[PDB]
Structure of Bacterioferritin:
Amino acid sequence: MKGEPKVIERLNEALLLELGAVNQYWLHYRLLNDWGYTRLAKKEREESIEEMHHADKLIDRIIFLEGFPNLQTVLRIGQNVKEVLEADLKGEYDARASYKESREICDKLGDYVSKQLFDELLADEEGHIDFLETQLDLLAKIGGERYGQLNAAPADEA
Amino acid sequence: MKGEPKVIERLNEALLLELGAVNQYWLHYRLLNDWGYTRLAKKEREESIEEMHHADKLIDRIIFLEGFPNLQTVLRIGQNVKEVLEADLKGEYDARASYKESREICDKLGDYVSKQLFDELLADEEGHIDFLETQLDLLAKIGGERYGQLNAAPADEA
Amino acid sequence: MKGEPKVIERLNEALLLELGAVNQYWLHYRLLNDWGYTRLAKKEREESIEEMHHADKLIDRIIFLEGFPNLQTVLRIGQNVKEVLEADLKGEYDARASYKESREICDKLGDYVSKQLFDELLADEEGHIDFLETQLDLLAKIGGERYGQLNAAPADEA
Amino acid sequence: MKGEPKVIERLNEALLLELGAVNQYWLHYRLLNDWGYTRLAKKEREESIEEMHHADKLIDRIIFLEGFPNLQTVLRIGQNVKEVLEADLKGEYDARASYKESREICDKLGDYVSKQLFDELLADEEGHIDFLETQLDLLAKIGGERYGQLNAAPADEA
Amino acid sequence: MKGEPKVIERLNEALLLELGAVNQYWLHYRLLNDWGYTRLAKKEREESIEEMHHADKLIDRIIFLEGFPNLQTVLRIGQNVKEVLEADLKGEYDARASYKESREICDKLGDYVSKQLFDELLADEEGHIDFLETQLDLLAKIGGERYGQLNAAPADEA
Amino acid sequence: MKGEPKVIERLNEALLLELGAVNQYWLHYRLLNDWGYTRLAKKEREESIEEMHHADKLIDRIIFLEGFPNLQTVLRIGQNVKEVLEADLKGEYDARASYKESREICDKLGDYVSKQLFDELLADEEGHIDFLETQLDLLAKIGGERYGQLNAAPADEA
Amino acid sequence: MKGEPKVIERLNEALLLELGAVNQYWLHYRLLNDWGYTRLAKKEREESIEEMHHADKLIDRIIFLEGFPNLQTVLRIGQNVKEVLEADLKGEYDARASYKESREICDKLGDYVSKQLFDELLADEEGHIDFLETQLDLLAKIGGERYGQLNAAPADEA
Ligand code: HEM
Ligand code: HEM
Ligand code: HEM
Ligand SMILES: [Cl-]
Ligand SMILES: [Cl-]
Ligand SMILES: [Cl-]
Ligand SMILES: [Cl-]
Ligand SMILES: [Cl-]
Ligand SMILES: [Cl-]
Ligand SMILES: [Cl-]
Ligand SMILES: [Cl-]
Ligand SMILES: [Cl-]
Ligand SMILES: [Cl-]
Ligand SMILES: [Cl-]
Ligand SMILES: [Cl-]
Ligand SMILES: [Cl-]
Ligand SMILES: [Cl-]
Ligand SMILES: [Cl-]
Ligand SMILES: [Mg+2]
Ligand SMILES: [Mg+2]
Ligand SMILES: [Mg+2]
Ligand SMILES: [Mg+2]
Ligand SMILES: [Mg+2]
Ligand SMILES: [Mg+2]
Ligand SMILES: [Mg+2]
Ligand SMILES: [Mg+2]
Ligand SMILES: [Mg+2]
């Protein structure tokens, strides 16, 4: 199905955001692991792998529409566990805004199946945002050192 | 262990090559799948996931040496199955050359464990090269259409 | 829920297309089987049975809306395996266009659950189109005789 | 049982042929594998291991007869799959002729158990010849590229 | 294989370091257990047993080279959990430096298998260093009392 | 329980003897293994590990009594299997004498639980002495070469 | 990867040594079995099969480097069990020396993966040497007739 160039453009913008999130979550996984926060690190790895699946779905849709997926292009880091979470959350807010605009563009152009892809991604993103906002609320309430302790394993495990 | 800046630089050059290979193999997986070469597509996916593990090991070593992993940066595509294989092979030859030079640099600077990482990557790469050269030899001998047929599934499978 | 006559009309147009696809895929199953392409034949049977389920869902929705399902009414055939695939693909493009227009009509009339039915059918159809386009691309690349061979079983199986 | 020198000589001629066949089949296994004909390669490996068992039986008989097994001594190669098969077949015809003459010599000298060893080897050899002649007939009938394709695995297997 | 006296000397220096580490880790296990840090204590026991295996491998290599293993000779203690970890880390840095120099000496003298032993020990040591540095980083970030709590069991377990 | 300095001194003398026995038995294990007496070697390894457990119990008791365990300090070797056994036996006789004197000192000072530890060690030691005396008696009766043969494995095992 | 001619030459020298060891160990297996030393015979068979795997790895590397493996070319025998072991040991010392020189040549020419192959073979060889030296030490200590008895089975087994 030869797709609308503007739809392919929006799918490629999403792909760039998702690839950036893959890399950011993976770097956060390895950073948190080195700091000793091995339980939060495992969650960050899982979040990276979820974004990998999103990137795969975007690539598949772009190829179906006979467009060219742009992976050649792809970061917010952080010096403590609060900054890492905040950086992830900023990324998710940015992706959410992109997908909201993209579903509107696909709807107006009549590509309702691409619209549906963006609707699914948007729902996913609000789930991720809910999770991260809750973690940052917990960190605020119990303090960063107890949040870190809660998200670390004893020495005989990891 | 605060690492030599030149060693961290070589690890980051490897990371850029590996991230590029992840993306190239994944794009090839989805492209080959859309063309109907679903068996070769599955191998390309597996090759991408192997390069993901290499990238992970490089990131881990960079962080141990107290360097900054550069993922912000990352392609050869192809219009038929021979060109896809050739593009993968060119990438592997380029990576091999990088790792050979890197093991020599780590050896001269006395970072023998980073040397060992590059030695492992080099052995891996020559394995990958052996595989791809064999596939291209088979394609040469039986022709591209029979090679494609061999690497496609019937309609009731995939 | 007494439905809009225009919505029931669009559901009946979909039912006619789906019943036509059931019959076409089933005839293709038996034709391909007689020609010896028993693996593609099995896929065509499966595609017919998928369209039977779609027809069932349309009938159920029409009856819920207190309309009369029109089954009394229901073809593109083909002389070789490429023509069979092309005929299936033309049918799918026609159905896709019908469902796109139907979801728009249901949306404008405020029957959002019927809209959702058409959205699901539209997504299904684009999946079917993706599959058939890939098979026709493979046939183009490896040639029709190798595509047929790939989709045939040896004599000791079927 | 102190054996006839002429019988020990014939057993040593067989051992030299068998050791040569071990080496030739093993080299063919690795060559075919590198060319991508991994299914025929596996058969060549199995044929090499069968010849290893024959060599073992010859060594055992020579030692029983209080002779000295000569292994210090041991090739036809090939540039394509037809030449490889032809080289194996020429070797088998040569071995068959040796074993026929050897059974006659053992019979005339009254070493009926060594005669029996050569009779078994001769029957084995005619089995091997039957197999190889059939493969070369198939290659002749379907052509070398289809024979190679039939004897190659897709990329996601080997 | 009668070994180079200088190689045997370096193997004996490693053995003395490893035996010292066995004793230090075991004393730390019992000390930490008495203080109530039973989870970190279990890790220290495991680390002692890993060093016992290293000592065994060194003794085996010395005997193969027809040298005399010197076990007759063998400590940093600590008053709190941070000091215990720091003492272990200082020991590991000292061992790493010894093994780096030893691999260079074996390489220059042409004892490449002893070189390989030291290369393995060096890689092990950098793993141990990575672990201990991470534990000390965690302790720094969450504080010593939370690190101790994390590494202690409730009264109904240990 | 703050212990008597004289009791802690006797526990530390026992620890020094036990650590010496660990090292001696382990060296004997590796020596006997290299000579080919692999069955006696396995027993010597087991004896070393038993002495490791004794050392652990001594360290635990010293720490309970708020003393400082001295591991910083720790040999009789042997050129044939009789000398190895004799060296082990001399060590056991020395340890037995130490533990006998130590139980008497603990009894007189009123540390009856430390007395009990030495009583257990003394009973253990007389068991070890019984075993070693029996092995040396067997060696005397059947001769050293048959004793060695009995305590060696064939080449296809170890 | 088109290899250095000097590297291919060293790989072929190793192949000739390994093929010679295969044959020597196999002949020793059958000889020892006929003499009644069936347990040592089984070990010699296992050693032959280990050398077969080494030869296979060498052939694979030569073909990858686009060289020609030379198998056309390939012995120390022995009249008693001590001479058989001594002949095996002389072969291993010769192979070790070859592999040491070969790893140095590959290193200087920059073929680090072939260097690694020779490093692995060298470590293997020193293991084999350790085993054989231990067997010859045992034979020296208990005498040849007891060593033979230890390595023979009773009549109701083999
Ligand atoms: C184009 C970009 C990428 C795509 C499309 C992608 C896709 C995937 C997919 C589909 C999986 C399978 C997950 C599952 O089975 O549930 C996966 C796993 C994984 N990914 Fe990625 N990935 C990408 C980039 C990366 C990067 C940059 C890394 C950095 C290390 C990475 C590391 C991993 C690892 C370690 C696994 C697990 C593999 C295993 O369990 O054996 N990936 N990826
Ligand atoms: C402070 C001195 C030592 C102490 C307290 C100690 C303690 C122990 C203990 C409690 C065990 C566990 C045994 C079991 O699970 O039944 C053990 C095992 C072992 N020990 Fe020691 N040990 C010491 C020194 C040594 C030395 C010098 C060596 C020389 C190699 C050694 C080699 C081993 C080995 C190989 C094991 C077996 C580990 C395994 O099975 O994974 N130990 N030791
Ligand atoms: C005197 C010459 C040789 C003799 C007598 C011999 C004998 C044997 C025998 C009896 C087996 C066991 C097969 C089975 O268990 O069914 C075997 C296996 C094998 N042979 Fe040979 N062989 C010889 C030469 C070679 C050569 C030149 C190669 C080249 C690579 C080779 C490679 C192998 C391999 C890889 C195996 C399989 C071992 C395993 O599965 O672990 N052999 N050989
Ligand atoms: Cl932090
Ligand atoms: Cl606090
Ligand atoms: Cl193609
Ligand atoms: Cl053709
Ligand atoms: Cl047709
Ligand atoms: Cl054709
Ligand atoms: Cl060919
Ligand atoms: Cl053709
Ligand atoms: Cl064909
Ligand atoms: Cl503390
Ligand atoms: Cl606090
Ligand atoms: Cl002895
Ligand atoms: Cl005697
Ligand atoms: Cl003998
Ligand atoms: Cl005697
Ligand atoms: Mg709308
Ligand atoms: Mg998500
Ligand atoms: Mg790889
Ligand atoms: Mg459908
Ligand atoms: Mg045969
Ligand atoms: Mg070097
Ligand atoms: Mg270690
Ligand atoms: Mg004891
Ligand atoms: Mg070996």
Notes: The helical segments of chain A are 5-35, 38-64, 81-109, 112-142, 144-150. Residues B 80-81, 148; C 141 surround chloride ion (ligand 6) (CB under 6 Å).
